[PDB]
């Protein structure tokens, strides 16, 4: 059905994402049980980590495009990422390593993330009709790797320790790198322009220096979220006023403020929703005992199933509006399951969290795998900059929001935690319903501006 380099890219993406979500699924619980962080500390440090891991993606697009070439930057990013995973496994020996290891994952991801997609677009003639389907399968590849990692990582951590799980993430990256090396032939004629000139050792050294410096800057920020907050505050307000001073661009801006809300909500899956499932949900579904942390796997699961269907099955503003209503419903559903459908002991049925994740993953499809491609369509390297910047700000804000659900380590009674989660999840749902409704109010004038 598909070109030969498609399958290489599919499996490289699967394994890289497996490694990343192997870390993401266990990271908040690792902060709490292993480093002894309070839930508030863990939630804000996860917010900072995810902010860096996402805000740095623009660099890697630029480096693959103009400095080293897309194929070289895939190799470099995979190597830095694997190093980061093995470094995170090493930090169970040397705890003071953890932040440097996390910054190495961030920078690794920053270099790697944008590049396989770019490579994939180049495996097909310029408007080959199979591209829509090839990119849907690419997203499903991300989510198969993610599903395996989110399901299995917590089990592995429970039975073998974190060092083994982080090392297995590293291993997933080394097998992605091996699949790339053993299919190098498939992509000999596919790449960006620097890929085909000889490599510039000056630019390679510049990238390695910047990478290292930025590893240290990330480790610092993750250790001191209170100045990351101000760095991103002032950065946002100053790119706010650079933006404001330079009519289809005002559409990209409001679309971005809505993607911000979506990413605040997305940020809850490894933090507040994860601990909600730990604390206030039955850990038994269809008669099987599971690790509650594995519940995060319900999002990629619903994506893997829903993406072909939705591919089969207005324009830009309505799709974003529908995604926002869906995320609203996911949180109102969580709030309702706590308010009305809980046990005497304060525990709620896992089916309610299955529906929460279905809603949230529909929202993801409508908003997240759509905004970037067509925000560009409305619009350039500045908006790519400021888009990844606002999404980093969204993960910082998400960590701060998750802290309203943080449970002191001495609380043991689920009826004591149930009302906290339901208050926060319901207010998140009601605000995101308001936001979705003003989105819908604005959809017509938006659709006109896109003309």
């Amino acid at each position, epitope marked *: 059905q598909q070109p030969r380099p498609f399958f290489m890219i599919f499996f490289v993406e699967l394994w890289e994402r497996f490694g990343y979500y192997g870390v993401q699924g266990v990271l908040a619980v690792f902060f*709490v*049980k292993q480093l002894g962080f309070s839930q508030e500390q863990a939630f804000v440090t996860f917010g900072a980590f995810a902010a860096l891991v996402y805000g740095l993606i623009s660099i890697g697009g630029y480096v693959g495009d103009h400095l080293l070439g897309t194929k070289r930057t895939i190799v470099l990013g995979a190597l830095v990422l694997a190093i980061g995973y093995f470094m995170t496994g090493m930090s169970l020996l040397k705890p003071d390593l953890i932040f440097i290891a996390l910054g190495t994952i961030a920078v690794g991801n920053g270099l790697f993330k944008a590049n396989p997609a770019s490579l994939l677009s180049k495996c097909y003639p310029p408007k080959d009709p199979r591209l829509d389907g090839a990119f849907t399968l690419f997203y499903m590849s991300i989510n198969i790797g993610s599903l395996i990692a989110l399901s299995l990582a917590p089990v592995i951590a*429970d*039975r073998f*320790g974190y060092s083994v799980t982080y090392n297995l993430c590293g291993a997933g990256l080394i097998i992605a790198l091996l699949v790339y090396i053993a299919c190098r032939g498939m992509v000999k004629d596919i790449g960006s322009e620097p890929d085909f000139r000889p490599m510039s050792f000056s630019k390679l050294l510049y990238v390695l220096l910047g990478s290292v410096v930025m590893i240290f800057v990330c480790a610092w920020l993750m250790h001191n979220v209170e100045v990351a907050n101000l760095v991103l505050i002032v950065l946002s307000i100053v790119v706010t006023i650079i933006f404001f001073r330079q009519n289809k661009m005002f559409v990209a801006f409001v679309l971005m403020l809505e993607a911000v809300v979506f990413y605040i909500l997305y940020a809850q899956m490894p933090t507040s929703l994860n601990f909600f499932a*730990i*604390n*206030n949900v*039955h*850990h*038994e579904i269809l008669g099987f*005992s599971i*690790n*509650p*942390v594995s519940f995060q796997a319900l999002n990629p699961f619903w994506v893997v199933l829903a993406s072909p269907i939705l591919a089969g099955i207005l324009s830009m503003p309505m799709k974003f509006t529908l995604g926002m209503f869906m995320c609203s419903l996911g949180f109102l559903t969580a709030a309702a399951a706590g308010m009305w459908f809980a*046990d*005497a*002991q*304060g*525990l709620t049925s896992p089916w309610f969290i299955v529906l929460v994740y279905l809603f949230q993953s529909l929202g993801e499809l409508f908003i997240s795998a759509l905004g970037l491609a067509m925000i560009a369509a409305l619009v350039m390297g500045f908006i790519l900059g400021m888009w990844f910047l606002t999404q980093a700000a969204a993960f910082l804000l998400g960590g701060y929001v998750a802290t309203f659900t943080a*449970v002191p*380590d*001495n*609380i*043991t*009674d*689920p009826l004591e*935690t149930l009302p906290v989660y339901t208050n926060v999840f319901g207010k998140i749902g009601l605000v995101t319903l308001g936001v979705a409704v003003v989105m819908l109010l604005m959809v017509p004038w938006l659709k006109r501006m896109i003309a």
Partner: nanobody
Amino acid sequence: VQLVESGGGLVQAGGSLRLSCAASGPTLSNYAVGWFRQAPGKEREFVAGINWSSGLRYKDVVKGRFTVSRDNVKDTVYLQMNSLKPEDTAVYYCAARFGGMLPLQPSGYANWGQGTQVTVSS
């Protein structure tokens, strides 16, 4: 996923016993451990537990008499029972649930030991 209790037995009113719960594969340190007891002709009831981060929960009748503690080098949880009374006579089960909650009913716990008999004679 399989826990083994140890340390039950027969003791005179006012004596002491120490129950221990151990786990096989999963590190017990990620788990709230609750001790339940079934007395003849009654339902399992929550006696006492410790969660994954040293929060404690007790049934009112056993406060100031029972102590739950945790050794996370031996991956083991203890129930020290002092001032034992005849009404403490029961089968004692340890049970394990991931995380920091100790819910009161057996349904909140996935993993269960087989049970040790504790008899307190007057």
